[PDB]
Amino acid sequence: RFHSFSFYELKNVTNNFDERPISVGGNKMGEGGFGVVYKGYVNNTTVAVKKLATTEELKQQFDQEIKVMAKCQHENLVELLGFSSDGDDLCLVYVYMPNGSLLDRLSCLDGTPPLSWHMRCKIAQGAANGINFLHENHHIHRDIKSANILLDEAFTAKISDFGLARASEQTVMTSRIVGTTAYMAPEALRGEITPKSDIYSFGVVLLEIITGLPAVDEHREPQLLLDIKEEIEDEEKTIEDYIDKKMNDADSTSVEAMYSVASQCLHEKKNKRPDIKKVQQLLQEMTAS
Numbered sequence: 001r002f003h004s005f006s007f008y009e010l011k012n013v014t015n016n017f018d019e020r021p022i023s024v025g026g027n028k029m030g031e032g033g034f035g036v037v038y039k040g041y042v043n044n045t046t047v048a049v050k051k052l053a054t055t056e057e058l059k060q061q062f063d064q065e066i067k068v069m070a071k072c073q074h075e076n077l078v079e080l081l082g083f084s085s086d087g088d089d090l091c092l093v094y095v096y097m098p099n100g101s102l103l104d105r106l107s108c109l110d111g112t113p114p115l116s117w118h119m120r121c122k123i124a125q126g127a128a129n130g131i132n133f134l135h136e137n138h139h140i141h142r143d144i145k146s147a148n149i150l151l152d153e154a155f156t157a158k159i160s161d162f163g164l165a166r167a168s169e170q171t172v173m174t175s176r177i178v179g180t181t182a183y184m185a186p187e188a189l190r191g192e193i194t195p196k197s198d199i200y201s202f203g204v205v206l207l208e209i210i211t212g213l214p215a216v217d218e219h220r221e222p223q224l225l226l227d228i229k230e231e232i233e234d235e236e237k238t239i240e241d242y243i244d245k246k247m248n249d250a251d252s253t254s255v256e257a258m259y260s261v262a263s264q265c266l267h268e269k270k271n272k273r274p275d276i277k278k279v280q281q282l283l284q285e286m287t288a289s
């Protein structure tokens with residue numbers, strides 16, 4: 001299904017996996033999902049090359065990334081073009097997403113203009129559509145976060161980084177708890193594996209979209225973004241206090257509607273959260289008129 005590269009090809013097209021940042025003239029775009037991602041050029045086409053950084057666990061993440069992409073073609077998932085497995089380093093080659101991660105566009109990293117509310121609504125809907133597609137195909141993502149939501153030429157959202165994905169038919173525990181704490185559901189932090197934890201993480205992403213704040217900031221009060229939900233419930237704050245001020249087109253009704261979805265996704269009790277189909281429906285009604 002996918003194209004098999006030899007490792008040296010991907011070496012050559014990434015300027016020998018040039019570790020310098022893009023801004024300095026190198027090829028490294030960033031790190032995440034248990035790999036480092038490089039910009040490459042293959043036959044006048046820009047590509048992204050993820051080079052995976054236990055040994056059996058790394059191969060398992062590689063095979064898991066490939067199996068999901070073979071079963072899951074969707075407008076809101078990144079597209080795998082090929083891979084390399086010869087040599088000592090496993091690589092995955094993807095269609096290039098020129099507007100980078102939702103995390104960096106929300107922070108306006110490198111001076112990119114702030115996302116409007118209208119764009120943010122399409123991003124939230126698209127990301128929900130991508131997660132829905134995963135869950136319908138019986139996969140748990142386990143690493144949902146704004147650094148793993150990329151944006152193409154039209155700022156369409158595409159979920160990425162499926163190395164931790166698990167098949168999903170009772171909820172089981174794992175002995176190896178992995179993920180980013182600021183996005184993880186309480187039961188995920190205790191080691192449970194369940195699609196209900198994906199929903200919780202998506203709720204944190206929705207708060208990032210509304211507020212333009214990162215999920216964790218050690219020099220901020222509160223440090224954890226998900227803490228604003230309890231402040232709003234306890235009427236110490238309003239969602240208006242936290243709405244990203246770098247937008248001119250956010251109306252109260254639809255922001256409160258997206259906040260309501262986020263609040264439901266963030267229910268402390270996993271069985272009280274909506275499933276992704278419900279999340280998808282509420283986000284569609286959000287922009288209906």
Ligand SMILES: COc1cc2ncc(-c3cccc(N[C@@H]4CCNC4)n3)n2cc1-c1cnn(C)c1
Pocket residue numbers: 029030031032033037047048050078094095096097098099100101104147148149150160161
């Ligand atoms: C302009 O930047 C990018 C363009 C781009 N096109 C495709 C990918 C891609 C595909 C599959 C997986 C994957 N993984 C990364 C690691 C964590 N989640 C994203 N990225 N991609 C990634 C970046 C990027 C990477 N780091 N930063 C800061 C930006």
